[PDB]
Design an enzyme around this catalytic site. Structure first.
Site, short mmCIF file in Angstrom:
data_model
loop_
_atom_site.label_atom_id
_atom_site.label_comp_id
_atom_site.label_asym_id
_atom_site.label_seq_id
_atom_site.Cartn_x
_atom_site.Cartn_y
_atom_site.Cartn_z
N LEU A 1 -21.98 13.18 49.31
CA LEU A 1 -22.16 14.42 50.45
C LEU A 1 -21.57 13.74 51.58
O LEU A 1 -21.84 12.26 52.06
CB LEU A 1 -23.62 14.50 50.61
CG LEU A 1 -24.35 15.10 49.45
CD1 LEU A 1 -25.80 15.45 50.15
CD2 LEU A 1 -23.85 16.53 49.24
N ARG B 1 -21.32 12.24 54.88
CA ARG B 1 -22.33 11.96 56.04
C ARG B 1 -21.60 11.04 57.05
O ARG B 1 -22.39 10.22 57.79
CB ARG B 1 -23.39 11.49 55.49
CG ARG B 1 -24.38 12.40 54.53
CD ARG B 1 -24.91 13.35 55.56
NE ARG B 1 -25.90 12.83 56.68
CZ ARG B 1 -26.07 13.17 57.86
NH1 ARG B 1 -25.82 14.56 57.98
NH2 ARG B 1 -26.84 12.46 58.72
N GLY B 2 -20.34 10.73 57.13
CA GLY B 2 -19.74 9.84 57.85
C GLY B 2 -19.07 8.56 57.11
O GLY B 2 -19.04 8.77 55.80
N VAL C 1 -24.73 8.88 50.94
CA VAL C 1 -25.75 10.07 50.72
C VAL C 1 -25.02 10.89 49.72
O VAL C 1 -23.89 11.08 49.62
CB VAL C 1 -26.08 10.55 51.55
CG1 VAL C 1 -26.87 11.95 51.50
CG2 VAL C 1 -26.84 9.79 52.71
N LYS D 1 -30.22 8.69 48.90
CA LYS D 1 -29.51 7.83 50.10
C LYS D 1 -29.75 6.36 49.80
O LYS D 1 -30.68 5.59 49.58
CB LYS D 1 -30.61 8.08 51.45
CG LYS D 1 -30.14 7.08 52.77
CD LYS D 1 -31.01 7.43 53.61
CE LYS D 1 -30.41 7.00 54.90
NZ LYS D 1 -31.51 7.06 55.98
N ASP E 1 -33.05 9.23 67.03
CA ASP E 1 -31.62 9.37 66.75
C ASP E 1 -31.84 10.83 66.52
O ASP E 1 -30.72 11.41 65.63
CB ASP E 1 -31.45 8.66 65.39
CG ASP E 1 -29.63 8.69 65.42
OD1 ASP E 1 -29.09 8.77 66.20
OD2 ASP E 1 -29.59 8.22 64.11
BR1 LIG Z 1 -28.90 15.01 53.18
C1 LIG Z 1 -29.89 13.46 53.78
C2 LIG Z 1 -29.33 12.43 54.75
C3 LIG Z 1 -30.30 11.61 55.07
N1 LIG Z 1 -30.22 10.37 55.72
N2 LIG Z 1 -31.20 9.91 55.95
N3 LIG Z 1 -32.12 10.57 55.32
C4 LIG Z 1 -31.41 11.68 54.87
C5 LIG Z 1 -32.32 12.54 53.99
C6 LIG Z 1 -31.32 13.80 53.55
BR2 LIG Z 1 -32.00 15.07 52.41
#
Ligand SMILES: Brc1cc2nn[nH]c2cc1Br
Length: 333
Positions: free
Chosen positions: A44, A46-47, A52, A67, A155
């Protein structure tokens, strides 16, 4: 002489009244499961930092999110786990399902309830007036809960809010920077992303609290109602405080500095200058005027204050006229 001490206006002593094991995450013993219960489907987005994945729980064929905890102190891993365990079942808090290690690499991973991979940042520049109020109220439920449970997120930003717009569902994610609030504790100011950092972080005032998250929330609200991403667009942590001073003005900033006897980094001496507090009408134009109301501006004003103690609490925010139609409709359903 030192900075003047500070205390949270709400939920001040909640961790003190808990058993030690609630907040003493360093002594938490983790039962690590086997990541081989899960098959990774895809990564996924996420940067660049994030690892993730969408995954499948073999046992029940249920979709989950994994994660992989990139190498970091075991202390920080225990902290995120204990906070997720403590908040589990809270309104709009992501559910931790499992804690595992890859059998080969021994790398720790967190397994979460499935959410759609649609963060609030992808959607929050396109919402109607009602939906901004609705989703802001949903985020406040999560923040009042974690604050009431002695935890600050630290955050809060659009990328850490997962939304299922179809089902009008929202989860606050990434508890990796979250910390237990203890009266008189001095915290690391190197938290939150630049645009969402409260003035306390920028001037190095360490005795901060839940109110940090309410500044971040104010920054998200301003971005949404003014369609201005980000609202405070600093080049770096020093310029970030200049961007804030150009809106909130320098008089209230120096009053804040004086009030807490904050030693201002000398680099600030030449860059802060002199700025009036700007009226919000300055940010209103034809393409955002349908999102801006007196209610919205009154609410935003009471989030974005230099003095952390002055900001609305999550519960005070939920009681603001901005949310009366959301409250009314929730009770109706
Ligand atoms: Br998508 C996701 C990304 C995350 N980063 N930190 N905790 C997380 C939980 C989920 Br679900």
């Amino acid at each position: 002489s030192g900075p003047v001490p500070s205390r949270a206006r709400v939920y001040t002593d909640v961790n003190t009244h808990r058993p030690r094991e609630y907040w003493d995450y360093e002594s938490h013993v983790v039962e690590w499961g086997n990541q081989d219960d899960y098959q990774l489907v895809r990564k996924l987005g996420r940067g660049k930092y994030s690892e993730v994945f969408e995954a499948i729980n073999i046992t029940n064929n249920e979709k989950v999110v994994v994660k992989i905890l990139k190498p970091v102190k075991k202390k920080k891993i225990k902290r995120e786990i204990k906070i997720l365990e403590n908040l589990r079942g809270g309104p709009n808090i992501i559910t931790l399902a499992d804690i595992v290690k890859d059998p080969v690499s021994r790398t720790p991973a967190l397994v979460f309830e499935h959410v759609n991979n649609t963060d609030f940042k992808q959607l929050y520049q396109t919402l109607t007036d009602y939906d901004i109020r609705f989703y802001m109220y949903e985020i406040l439920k999560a923040l009042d809960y974690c604050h009431s449970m002695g935890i600050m997120h630290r955050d809060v930003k659009p990328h850490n809010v997962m939304i299922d717009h179809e089902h009008r569902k929202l989860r606050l994610i990434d508890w990796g920077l979250a910390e237990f609030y203890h009266p008189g504790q001095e915290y690391n100011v190197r938290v939150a992303s630049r645009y969402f950092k409260g003035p306390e972080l920028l001037v190095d005032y360490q005795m901060y609290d839940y109110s940090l998250d309410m500044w971040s929330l104010g920054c998200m609200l301003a971005s949404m109602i003014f369609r201005k991403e980000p609202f405070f667009h600093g080049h770096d942590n020093y310029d970030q405080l200049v961007r804030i001073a150009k809106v909130l003005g320098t008089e209230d900033l120096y009053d804040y500095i004086d009030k807490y006897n904050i030693e201002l980094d000398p680099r600030f001496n030449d860059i802060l200058g002199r700025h009036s507090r700007k009226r919000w009408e300055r940010f209103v134009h034809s393409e955002n005027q349908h999102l801006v109301s007196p209610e919205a501006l009154d609410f935003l004003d009471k989030l974005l204050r230099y003095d952390h103690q002055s900001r609305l609490t999550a519960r005070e925010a939920m009681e603001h006229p901005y949310f009366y139609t959301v409250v009314k409709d929730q009770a109706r359903m």
